[PDB]
Design a protein around this ligand. Structure first.
Ligand SMILES: [K+]
Ligand SMILES: [Mg+2]
Ligand SMILES: [Mg+2]
Ligand SMILES: [Mg+2]
Ligand SMILES: [Mg+2]
Ligand SMILES: [Mg+2]
Ligand SMILES: [Mg+2]
Ligand SMILES: [Mg+2]
Ligand SMILES: [Mg+2]
Ligand SMILES: [Mg+2]
Lengths: 236, 124, 26, 152, 181, 205, 41, 46, 93
RNA sequence: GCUAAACCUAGCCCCAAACCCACUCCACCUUACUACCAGACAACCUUAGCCAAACCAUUUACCCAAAUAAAGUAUAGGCGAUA
RNA sequence: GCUACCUAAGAACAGCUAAAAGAGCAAGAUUUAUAGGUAGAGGCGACAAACCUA
RNA sequence: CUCCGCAUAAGCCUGCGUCAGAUUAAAAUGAACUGACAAUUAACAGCCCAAUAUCUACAAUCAACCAACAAGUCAUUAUUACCCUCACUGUCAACCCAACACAGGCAUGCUCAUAAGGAAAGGUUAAAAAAAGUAAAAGGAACUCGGCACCUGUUUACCAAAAACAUCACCUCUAGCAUCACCAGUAUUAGAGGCAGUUCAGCUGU
């Protein structure tokens, strides 16, 4: 049993009365689980290259909160700053520079970026930027536990990248080493506005349903059918 | 082969041993002829429980309470608060004389008292 | 644990020889 | 009271009284089926059935018809890491039968419904854990192990 | 009634039960003897209820709700005994000047050790007591050598402990040289 | 009460917790940790005080002390001197990555002056009234001891008495009239218990 | 002062290096090796 | 025909033969207790 | 087996600590101090081994003579036994 | 590649200096750790054999108040061993 | 607490010839539970110089 | 299959009840191992009794008849004193002392063949040798160290013989006496010694 309920159900069935623990100390979180207000990427945005006023107003309300904690903040500079953070973070993957990567990405992003490539070799390069990145959305969380206020900024990036992933044995499993390809990404950046040392770090990516299917993998795959016990009969 | 370390109790030994040894309960009587047990009412402890109706004190105290310094009671402090005032008044009036210590509550002996301080003859 | 340094140092040099033979440097 | 000398009684002496009894008892759920008028207690070793009847009637105003006791042996089988026996303490069990046709049933002191009403007292850590687990997706078989982070 | 052994039916199932602070000795010292006598049974019924809940929690294999309540109640009853004992102790000193409530005497035992012998109550005088006289409150010369061996055993243990403390101090200075003083 | 074995290794988890039991089982016998002895009077670090880290991954940063483990001369500074670990991980689930602080020794941490946020040294001194306060070695200023939530978890301002909590008026009220009588004698008089039988003398030996 | 040999390993290897090409336990067990090595020398 | 079954446990015999009161009954028995006390025996007697 | 796989903590001896720096001072207290004190008076140690040397038998005899009355019972018993053992050993019995 | 290997502390030893110990409550000489009945029992008296004499038969050692020296001297002793 | 002997107070023993009660076939110089006593220069022994917890 | 079984005593002390286990038996259900929880409730049994004096010749055996000898577990009164009551403890188990193939040991009541309690075979094959059992032509111990069929008591051995010891009787020896053995005895006593079936016929794997 993995779930906690099953563990505590097994614990009550074992008479292992585990008392809870109260302490002044608590786990200190530098980021959040997910996006504060998901930004649905308008369908057809890639094709191109009163509601708008209401949505823009929310960004204007949020940007004020960010300015309060840090007065010397310009939303105009962020797209260039975000582009640099995005490129540096991915470059860390090429050489497994995890300690540097931790400064550039949050603890929510870090597992997603590095877990799958632990025993793989990643070669990634930022060839070009097709159109300038612009801040599509700006949100800010309400007061949370420990007086932690977070600010999330979503940046739309349309760029030309190159990715080649090799397996544990040096054999190419995905992508092409040098062929540049066009990628449209919406990248949310988060910062702990309360923390006196918080900085803007990559948080998560937004994947719209209309997004085109990604590059096919080289190797063939077998999806196994139902493994049935002798009594059970297969049903189409 | 016998277990030396284990606690010796009335569960162990033959019938004679098991009957004689008890678990520390105080006797409330005696045995007469025919192993008849006579229970003495006075030996049985009488529980003195007060009337709790209209009683304001509760098991806990509110946390909004002024903390105070701990001053354990002493014989001197009890004398200054219970016996000193009466002697002080009599001394000013000249009525006080050593021979009459009992007037202020002094007990020359504990004999003849229901509750004797020493040797203590009463239960908690 | 036996007190002394010379034997431990000599054995360290011994282990380094094997570390070289096991993986001969380029 | 326990761990206190009892004043010796002589024929014709005063009644023995205990003003602040240090006897503490536990009402317990019977391990087996009992009659409706029977209540089971765990009491100290020194407490006699006569004490328990006076204790319940005097302090709790519970009319007691009959009281029976027994001494439960506590297992001495367990051995610690030093192979030294660990003694589960012996305790005394009392069975009290209520007078005047009164009956007792041990209450449910841990109601499953009331224990888990799903009251809202959001924990910052707990929400983050559950939330991220929902975001967690099984690896797509068709991707065949390829990292899903890269937009390319 | 029997329901006094259980908590307020509302509390049953609640994860926690908020409770106040335990009585302090100074707070109880202000109260009268009659109030302390009534408070004892107020605390006693609370203690029995908590002891009952604690056992049922084990029977149900669940954690006891707000276990610190039992610690507080035991603290208050312990404080109440101390406050009442101090009043009796002080009163005994004034009226009799006796340090202890129970008479006793310093005695030597059959093993040569010096022990404080607490007296028991008897209906007959000690010289007529068959069982009491069998006890030997003296030691014979053969005990003298064992007393010396016991004393030397004590000295060896004391010497080792003092030597160890000095050694630990030298280890401390070795790791933290600034502590030379 | 807990009967901690000698040379018990104090760690981040409190003694008696689930983690402590698995880490320090009764049979475990590890080399003792040599801790510099600091008297309770000489201890100048408390939970809630702003402190500057002098060594480690992020030296020169300032944060509040969230926990003090005296047995190890340890101060835990929230969000600083951290590494990363997974919490809630299972075989099926990778788990959630969080930042976890590592303990810092008292020497590795320095107090910061209130007027100017800079590392400073303090010496315990007495105020004119008589209170004991910490004064900085350079440009002496009183460093008010931080205000931290009580370990019991009770906030006096939000406290509301319960059905079993005695009121302030009732607890403070003084009913004790000192007199030369025991609780037994007073209670019998109050309850009108009549005992006319004399207590027969017994022998004590 | 308590003295214990700390370099016995090297003393044994002096014998064993001459017994590597021997057959069986003579090539590794010192007490067997030494006797065969002495005969070889 | 039986072997190694010399021990026929009897609590009355065990207490009477090796009991505390028996040891104290004579000076030699008292010294037995003293030796075990010196050695630190957990059980001085049966 | 039997040989440590790592180097022991490096040995750092302070040759100029106060004890070493002043070693030997006053060993000529008599020759240079009008013989008011003899160098053997500087010797610290057991009362029975100050300015005196001997083999184990002689040491045991000397210790029993000087502090035998103050010794612990078991220690004195061992010392008496040792002397008897050494007396036979050193006299070729 | 397994089995394993490796470790530095826990403490301990010898001295010095100082003459140590111990009544929370309760229980404990009866079958110890057992609340509560006419007691009566009372301690004192060469250590021995034996290391050695190559056996053994008298014979040798374990204490009595200052390191050293007088001195292994006076002296004792199958005048042998040895003391 | 084995064993030898002893002390106290117990217990057991079908049928068959059956006068006689007796290791007749299958009620005794029998067997046996409990507690106690005798101790190594010794004890105990229907005496094997045996046994006295190997 | 039953060899027992149930109960008590003694011993033992939670040692196959529930839940859980990643531990365990050949056995990843069982579990006697581990963790938690529960449990045996007095009427049975144990635990007894005021003093002082005084009383107590007549066995048991169906106790009657007929008998005995080794001569026997079973009893009061007087006067004084005494108005009180149901406490305390044992109560579980597949269990003890052993031996480590039950090798064995183990008091009493009841059941006398069970209404209670149990399972000799992990699977296969069906060599030798080995163990036990059964059957066996003709013969019937042949060939083999040796088959089978002055009283009493213990002993090694066992069908047993033999010797030893004990012992009835017998004999000598010492002792004229009481308040711890001999003995609450008294020379008709006490103690210590000595005691001098074959053959044949018949049957058997010998
Ligand atoms: K058992
Ligand atoms: Mg009962
Ligand atoms: Mg009865
Ligand atoms: Mg039963
Ligand atoms: Mg059946
Ligand atoms: Mg079978
Ligand atoms: Mg088979
Ligand atoms: Mg034939
Ligand atoms: Mg023939
Ligand atoms: Mg024939």
């Amino acid at each position: 049993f993995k779930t906690e309920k099953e563990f505590m159900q097994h614990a009550r069935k074992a008479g292992l009365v585990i008392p809870p623990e109260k302490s002044d100390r608590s786990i200190h979180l530098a980021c959040t689980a997910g996006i504060f207000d998901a930004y649905v990427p308008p369908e057809g945005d890639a094709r191109i290259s009163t509601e708008r006023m209401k949505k823009t107003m929310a960004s204007q309300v949020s940007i004020r909160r960010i300015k309060d904690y840090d007065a010397n903040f310009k939303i105009k500079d962020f797209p260039e700053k975000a582009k640099d953070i995005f490129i540096e973070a991915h470059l860390c993957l090429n050489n497994s520079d995890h300690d540097r990567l931790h400064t550039l990405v949050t603890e929510h992003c870090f597992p997603d970026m590095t877990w799958d490539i632990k025993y793989k070799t990643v070669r990634w390069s930022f060839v070009e930027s097709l159109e300038p990145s612009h801040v599509v959305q700006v949100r800010c969380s309400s007061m949370m536990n420990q007086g932690n206020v977070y600010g999330q900024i979503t940046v739309r990036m349309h760029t030309r990248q190159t990715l080649a992933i090799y397996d544990r044995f040096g054999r190419l499993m995905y992508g092409q080493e040098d062929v540049p390809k066009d990628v449209l990404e919406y990248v949310v950046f988060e910062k702990q506005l309360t923390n006196p040392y918080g900085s803007w770090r990559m948080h998560t990516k937004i994947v719209p349903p209309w997004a085109p299917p990604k590059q096919p993998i080289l190797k063939t795959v077998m999806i196994p059918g139902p493994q049935l016990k002798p009594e059970e009969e297969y049903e189409e | 082969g016998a277990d030396r370390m284990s606690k010796w109790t009335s569960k162990r030994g033959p019938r004679s041993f098991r009957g004689r040894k008890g678990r520390g309960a105080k006797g409330i009587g005696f045995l007469t002829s025919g192993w008849r047990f006579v229970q003495i009412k006075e030996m049985v402890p009488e529980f003195v429980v007060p009337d709790l109706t209209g009683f304001k004190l509760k098991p806990y105290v509110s946390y909004l309470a002024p903390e105070s310094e701990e001053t354990p009671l002493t014989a001197a402090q009890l004398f200054s608060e219970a016996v000193a005032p009466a002697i002080e008044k009599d001394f000013k009036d000249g009525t006080f004389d050593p021979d009459n210590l009992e007037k202020y509550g002094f007990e020359p002996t504990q004999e003849g008292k229901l509750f004797q301080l020493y040797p203590r003859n009463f239960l908690r | 644990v036996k007190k002394g340094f010379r034997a431990a140092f000599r054995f360290q040099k011994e282990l380094e020889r094997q570390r070289l033979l096991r993986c001969p440097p380029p | 009271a326990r761990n206190v000398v009892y004043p010796l009684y002589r024929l014709g002496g005063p009644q023995l009284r205990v003003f602040r009894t240090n006897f503490f008892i536990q009402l317990v759920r019977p391990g087996v089926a009992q009659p409706e008028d029977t209540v089971q207690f765990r009491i100290p070793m020194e407490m006699t059935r006569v004490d328990l009847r006076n204790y319940l009637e005097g302090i709790y105003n519970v009319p007691v018809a009959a009281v029976r006791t027994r001494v439960q042996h506590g297992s001495n089988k367990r051995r610690d890491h030093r192979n030294v026996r660990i003694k589960k303490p012996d305790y005394k069990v009392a069975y009290v039968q209520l007078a005047h046709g009164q009956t007792f049933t041990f209450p449910d002191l841990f109601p499953e419904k009331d224990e888990s009403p799903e009251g809202s007292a959001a924990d910052d850590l707990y929400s983050m854990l559950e939330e991220e687990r929902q975001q967690r997706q099984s690896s797509d078989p068709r991707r065949g192990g390829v990292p899903s982070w890269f937009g390319l | 009634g029997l329901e006094e052994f259980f908590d307020d039916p509302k509390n049953w199932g609640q994860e926690k039960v908020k409770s106040g602070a335990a009585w302090t000795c100074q707070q109880l010292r202000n109260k009268s003897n009659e109030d302390l006598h009534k408070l004892w049974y107020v605390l006693l019924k609370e203690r029995n209820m908590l002891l009952t809940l604690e056992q049922e929690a084990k029977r149900q294999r669940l954690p006891m709700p707000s276990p610190e309540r039992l610690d507080k109640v035991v603290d208050s009853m312990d404080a109440l005994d101390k406050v009442v004992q101090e009043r009796e102790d002080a009163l005994r000193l004034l009226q009799t000047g006796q340090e202890r409530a129970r008479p006793g005497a310093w005695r030597r035992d059959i093993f040569g050790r010096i022990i404080w012998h607490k007296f028991k109550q008897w209906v007959i005088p000690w010289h007529l007591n068959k069982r009491y006289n069998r006890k030997r409150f003296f030691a014979l010369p053969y005990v003298d050598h064992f007393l010396r061996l016991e004393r030397e055993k004590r000295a060896r243990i004391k010497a080792r402990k003092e030597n160890l403390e000095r050694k630990k101090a030298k280890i401390l200075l070795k790791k933290f040289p600034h502590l030379a003083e | 009460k807990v009967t901690l074995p000698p040379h018990y290794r104090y760690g981040m988890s409190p003694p008696g917790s689930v983690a402590d039991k698995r880490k320090n089982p009764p049979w475990i016998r590890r080399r003792p940790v040599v801790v510099e002895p600091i008297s309770d009077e000489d201890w100048y670090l408390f939970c809630g005080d702003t402190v500057e880290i002098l060594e480690g991954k992020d030296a020169g940063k300032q944060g509040k002390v969230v926990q003090v483990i005296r047995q190890r001369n340890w101060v835990v500074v929230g969000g600083l001197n951290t590494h990363y670990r997974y919490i809630g991980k299972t075989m099926d689930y990778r788990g959630t990555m969080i930042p976890s602080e590592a303990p810092l020794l008292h020497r590795q941490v320095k107090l910061v002056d209130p007027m100017d946020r800079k590392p400073t040294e303090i010496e315990w001194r007495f105020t004119e009234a008589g209170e004991r306060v910490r004064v900085s070695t350079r440009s002496g200023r009183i460093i008010p001891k931080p205000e931290f939530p009580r370990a019991d978890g009770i906030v006096p301002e939000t406290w509301i008495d319960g059905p079993k909590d005695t009121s302030v008026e009732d607890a403070l009220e003084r009913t004790y009239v000192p007199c030369l009588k025991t609780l037994q004698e007073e209670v019998m008089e109050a309850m009108g218990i009549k005992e006319t039988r004399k207590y027969k003398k017994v022998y004590w030996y | 002062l308590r003295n214990r040999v700390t370099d016995r390993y090297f003393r044994i290897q002096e014998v064993l290096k001459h017994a590597r090409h021997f057959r069986g336990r003579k090539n590794r067990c010192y007490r067997l090796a030494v006797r065969t090595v002495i005969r070889a020398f | 025909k039986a072997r190694g079954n010399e021990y026929q446990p009897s609590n009355i015999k065990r207490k009477n033969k090796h009991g505390w009161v028996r040891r104290l009954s004579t000076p030699a028995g008292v010294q037995v207790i003293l030796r075990r006390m010196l050695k630190g025996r957990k059980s001085l007697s049966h | 087996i039997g040989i440590r796989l790592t180097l022991p903590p490096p040995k750092v001896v302070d040759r100029w600590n106060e004890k070493r720096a002043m070693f030997g001072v006053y060993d000529n207290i008599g020759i240079l101090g009008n013989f008011e004190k003899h160098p053997k008076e500087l010797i610290r140690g057991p009362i029975w081994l100050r300015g005196w040397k001997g083999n184990e038998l002689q040491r045991c005899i000397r210790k029993r003579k000087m502090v035998g009355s103050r010794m612990f019972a078991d220690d004195l018993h061992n010392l008496n036994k040792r002397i008897r053992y050494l007396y036979k050993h050193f006299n070729r019995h």
